[PDB]
Structure formats: C-alpha cells, structure tokens
Design a protein around this ligand. Structure first.
Ligand SMILES: O=C(O)[C@@H](O)[C@@H](O)[C@H](O)[C@H](O)CO
Ligand SMILES: O=C(O)C(=O)C[C@H](O)[C@H](O)CO
Ligand SMILES: [Mg+2]
Ligand SMILES: [Mg+2]
Lengths: 384, 383
C-alpha cells in the first residue's frame, strides 16, 4: 500500500517531543519518534521540507529501500538531525508493517528472547545521603539496578554550569562506597560521568571504583575519536558504556571491534531506527557487547515502546534505561507496554503499540528549551 | 563588541542559498554561508530556532569560545546540519574580526603564501567528444586544470540509473582521448562520485595511471575510512576525498595513514575557518594538500572566504571553481577576482563578500533535491 499522507506533530506535554506520522491509502498508520533535545525544530524542518514531500506515494512496505533512499539520497550522510529524521520514518514504517502483519513488533523482529526487560532508575541527590535516600525508594518500587549521581562539594537558552574535574574525581568513589555500604552487593549500580574526563582521568576513576563492582561507567570521555577509549580499557576492569550521543554505527564500529566497551547506548530515535540498530546490535554480538538503550525523558513513549519491543527480541540485550515520562506525556502517547516490579513488559498489540492522541497533543504548544553548557572554573567551555 | 542582532537570509538567485548575518553593537557586520544543498531548511531552522537566540549579547570577538560553545553545547556533535550552522557563525565572526582589524582575511590568517590561487573548471559532456570540446573552451579561458566527465554508453530527487561495469570499461577512454588531444601539461581531474567499491576503484586507479591524473575523487563511500586502504595499496594515481565530510573526525585516519593526497571538505560544511585550520594543519604533517569543494551550491560568501584561506594556507592544492549565475553574483557583491585561470584574493577588510538584502528578497526559496542513483535492478545506490 502506498503512502497517502505524512506529517509531523510537535507537542510539549512537560517537554518537547516531535513525532512523525505516516498514513497509507488504506487508512492504516504508524508513528515514529523524531525528538532531538534542544535542537527539535531542526529535525521538524528536515522532515517537513525535505523528507515528507518525498514519502507521499511511496510503497510503505519498502522499509529498507526507504532507509537507503533517505540515508544515501541525502548525499550528506550521518548526523543527529539527519539520522533522527531517518529514524522517525523507519519507526513509523516498522509500526505499519507490524500492524499489517497483525503482530506486536517483537514478533516481527524474530520473537521474544526474554519474558521481561530489566530497567534501571535514576537516583540523584544533592549529596551522597540524598542519593542513598533515592536508591532506597527506587528499590522499594522494584528496581534491581540504579544509576547514582550526587552533587560535588565545592532554560530557554543554555544554563551555564561550572565544573571541576579533580573535585569530582576525589568525591566520586565515596558515593559508590556509601551505596555498597548501605545496600550490599546484589544491587546493580550504574554511573554516568557525562563526558567530563580525559582518558587517563577515566582510567584512574575506573580503577578507584573497581572495589564497588559497577554495572557500568558511562560516557567517560568524548569519543568522536574512538581511540579515546583505549587507555581506559587497558587500565581498568570496571565495565564501560557509551553512545547516547552517537547516531551511526560508524561512530562506534572501532569501539566495538576493539572490545573497548561493554554496552552500546545509542537509542532508536537518534540511531536511524530499527533498521540501523539491528546492524549495530549485530556487530555488538560478535564482541560480547550488549545493548543499553539511552532512555531519558527526551525520547518519547513512541521510541520507548519500540525500544521495549527491540529489547524483548534482541539476543544481546543488556539493560533498558527508565526515566518515567510525566502523566501528561503518557496521556498524549497511549501505549500498551507496562512497567511491573522494576521491569518492562512488551505490548501485545500489533505495531510497536504506541499511538499519538493528536487532539490532546494540540493542547500543548512547543516551548523552546536548551541543554546546559559546562565551563571550568577559569571559564573554559567544557563538555556538559 | 557584543552581538546586537543575528538572522538568516534564504534566497534563490538560480538556486538556494542560506546566509547568516551577524551585527554588533557598533553596526559592524559579518556574513557566513549556511547552504546545505537539498536540505537547506534544516540548517535554516537549526540557526533560526536554536543558535541565533543564543548569539545575542555574546562577545563577537570570542570566535574560538563561540565555536566550542555551539559545537560542544549542541550535545549532539558533528553532522551536516550541525557543522554547517556552526560554519556560518564562524565565517561571519571571522568576517567581523578581519573588519575590526582593517585587514583582508588572508592577512589575519598569516599573510599570503602565494600570489594567485589555481583553480580547475568542469568540462562535462554526453560524449567523450563533447567533453573534449568543453576542455578546449576552458583552456582558452586560462584554466590550467579541468575536471573531465562524459556520459556512459548504454522538486523531488531525479532517479538516475547506474552501471559500474560499463563505467569502468568506458572511463579510461576519456582520459586517453584527453591526453591525445591536449598533451601532458594540463592537469586532468576526475570525480568518480561515490559509485565504486574499493577494489573497483583500485582497478580504475591502475587503469588510469598512464594518463597521470591530478586526482581521482570520491572513489568510494568513506564513512568507513578503511575503505581507502585497498585503493592506495594498489595504485599510484593520486586520491582526493571529503566534500561530503563535516568533521576532522571524518578524515583523521585517512590523513594519518596517508590514504589520500587532497582533502576536499569546504568551509561552509566543515565548521568554517576555525575547524578547517585544524584540518589543514593535520593534513600538512602527512603531505596532504587542500582541494576545497567549490560547486555552485556553496555561495560566493564561502568562495571569497575560501580564496582568502587558499591564499594563506601553506599546503594549498587547488580550488574548484563552478561559476555562479550572474544573479547569484549580484546578490553577493564581492571583491575576489578571476583572471587567466586563477583567483586573486580581495583586498578589503573581512572576507570581502556582502549580501544585497533587497535583491535577495526578490528570489524566494524554491525546493530542489539532489538526484538519487539506482542500479539497473533498482537497487538504491550511491549518487
Ligand atoms: O543517561 C542519561 O539519561 C543522560 O545522559 C541524559 O539524560 C542526557 O543528559 C539527556 O538525555 C540529553 O538530552
Ligand atoms: O563538484 C563536485 O566535485 C561535486 O561532486 C558536486 C556535488 O555533487 C554537489 O555540490 C552536491 O551539492
Ligand atoms: Mg548518559
Ligand atoms: Mg565531487
């Protein structure tokens, strides 16, 4: 069946989301996430002006061909705006194919490899003790894994934050010691360094936290130069994760083949969708690397539902990040995935099982909001 | 001085161009090219909605800090849309800085390294003979270098058909004909435009060694930079690549492994003067030279700034010249000049290019997409 209509929907049920909707001649439809936090309108224009007009009249079943058409056809390849636009189309086309097959997406991908998908929760506090308070509450909600972040002693436009690496390095290990001290060894404990270290600094950190056996240490260093991971991997056995800022397998091919990471974090909506992420997960499986999908509030329930289906099938699944969306967001994107006892259960409806309530989405107009920047104490513009 | 205003202009004097204008508290101003062929409105929105609002009140003199601020601050790094928006800001701030300095941009960059900048022309035809005719006409205009292209016998994107095997059998005849009629002094360039696999490109490279090409360009899609290894190991025909790149990270290994001789990434797509300085610096360590992509889909703002960069940069190789329409030239009054096959950098402060906002408004945006290639079985291929 041919594509009859395609259009984007922009909404701000607590924060901005951009969604692509594709409708066939038969009335069947599918949606895909197109949200790129803090650059949302770039993807909206990429879709409205350059992609959507070319979708009309295309065979909706030709997912692979459409992917190549958009990826190669763009001439300028890869990039967050580019691959997010591509992801959105791809996710809507998988949604449609699954519906057409009368199957939940996980069935179409190869069937279920697990009964539930483990998540991790965000436990953040101004201080260690505040963070420990949050770990306690999330464990009570059933989470078996937690990401711990604490303040270090000492917005429409980007907020400006200040950073000290050495203050962070001397404080971080205390957080993890305190977590283990209180909650014991069974809990999976994750930590996101969020790009702020150099490789030898991350190496030191990795070593220092070895006694606390972290599930992962995430985004140690900016990795446009993938070789950046080498010194870290050679100096510590703390497991490493990276990739939420990646959009292409070509951003992480060397990382994976060299066994420099344990978990690949690139999610569906920024990594070119289901089609592209199958290939990434495939390469990963050759090197013992597992999926650890980025799952913040700035990827919509559409991506989350798709991700949960993907997580249900993919053999080398690692973990699924869970930052719950607001009530309002959840109402704008009705879905059949469910959270129970610290795990997700995939939906059983045909498609990825997520919809968009267009009338409700219309009640929340877009509101500009930018990610923060980080500066060192001398004013140097650093990595946030 | 602080930035007082910043805004984009979208105009279509023969084809689409996007331009960023930055204006300081004193009325001084600079422009930067922001044109991304076939995806123009993505860049326009990136700038209009997300970058411009943050530019206001910023110190215009802080070029480096602004570059890092937009590059790192974006969070999602690199990419065609991303690095073009950044290139436009960068180019406009260097315009402004050179203006404040009372110097043409090349002086600000380190002074002139050469007295003129060699260009190459496009010589395209349906048949080899058509091509030779175009070569002759450009040689008479003073061009010492031509990029030769002939046909292979046998609003939305046009869809072309492609056959590698027919091309591989035909292309060597074009270069042999070119040498036969024009001899050995002329530099002869060829752009394979992404259509080959590495071992195919290696075959082609070897086939054309007798004709001593200035370069063989974009042999293979190079997202995987290792793609170049087989070609380099099997032929001594020089290799150029990079018009589709936007980051030093797209080409670091290619350069460090000496897999190419010319880096093609241009100012507007490669993060501007600031980023391209670093690319040129890395290239010089490995005897790689600059060969800026210079099609009509980069505006005269880019061309003027490129000519300046070309004038200073020690490891300059060549500058591509596809002449813009007279209408384009009128929208972007400029002081670089073409003489006898070479550019001369302008001598006015800044990069020497302006935009006529009243004329630009006479040419509204019109959507136009690049072609796609399909093989004969309908496989969606590389264009
Ligand atoms: O792992 C994470 O959840 C963070 O790195 C993200 O919340 C990130 O800061 C934002 O998603 C960026 O949009
Ligand atoms: O001039 C060249 O070398 C080209 O390959 C031109 C490109 O196809 C064109 O600029 C794409 O916008
Ligand atoms: Mg993170
Ligand atoms: Mg080319």
């Amino acid at each position: 069946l041919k594509i009859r209509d395609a259009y984007t929907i922009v909404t701000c049920p607590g924060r901005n989301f951009v969604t692509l909707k594709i409708v066939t001649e038969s009335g069947t439809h599918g949606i895909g996430d197109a949200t790129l936090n803090g650059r949302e309108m770039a993807v909206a224009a990429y879709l409205d002006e350059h992609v959507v007009p070319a979708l009309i009249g295309r065979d909706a079943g030709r997912i692979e061909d459409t992917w190549q058409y958009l990826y190669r056809g763009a001439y300028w390849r890869r990039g967050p705006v580019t691959m997010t636009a591509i992801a959105a189309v791809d996710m809507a086309l998988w949604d449609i194919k699954a519906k057409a097959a009368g199957m939940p997406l996980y069935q179409l991908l190869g069937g279920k490899s697990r009964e539930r998908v483990m998540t991790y929760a965000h436990c953040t506090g101004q201080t260690i003790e505040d963070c420990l308070g949050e770990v306690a509450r999330h464990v009570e909600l059933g989470y078996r894994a937690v990401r711990v972040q604490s303040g270090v002693p000492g917005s429409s436009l980007p907020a400006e934050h200040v950073w000290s690496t050495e203050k962070y390095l001397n404080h971080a290990p205390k957080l993890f010691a305190a977590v283990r001290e209180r909650f014991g060894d069974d809990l999976h404990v994750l930590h996101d360094v969020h790009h702020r270290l150099t490789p030898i600094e991350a190496a030191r950190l990795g070593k220092a936290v070895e006694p606390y056996h972290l599930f992962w240490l995430e985004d140690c260093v900016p990795a446009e130069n993938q070789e950046s991971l080498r010194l870290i991997r050679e100096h510590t056995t703390t497991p490493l994760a990276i990739g939420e800022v990646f959009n292409s397998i070509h951003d992480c091919r060397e990382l994976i083949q060299n066994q420099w990471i344990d978990y690949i974090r690139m999610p569906l909506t920024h990594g070119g969708g289901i089609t592209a992420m199958r290939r990434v997960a495939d390469l990963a499986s050759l090197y013992h690397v597992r999926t650890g999908f980025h799952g913040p509030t700035d990827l919509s329930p559409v991506c989350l539902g798709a991700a949960i289906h993907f997580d249900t099938w993919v053999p080398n699944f690692g973990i699924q990040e869970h930052m719950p969306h607001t009530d309002e967001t959840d109402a704008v994107f009705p879905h059949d995935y469910r959270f129970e006892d610290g795990h997700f259960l995939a939906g059983e409806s045909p498609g990825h099982g997520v919809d968009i309530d267009e009338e409700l989405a219309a009640k929340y107009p877009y509101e500009r909001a930018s990610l923060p920047v980080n500066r060192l104490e001398d004013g140097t513009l650093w990595h946030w």
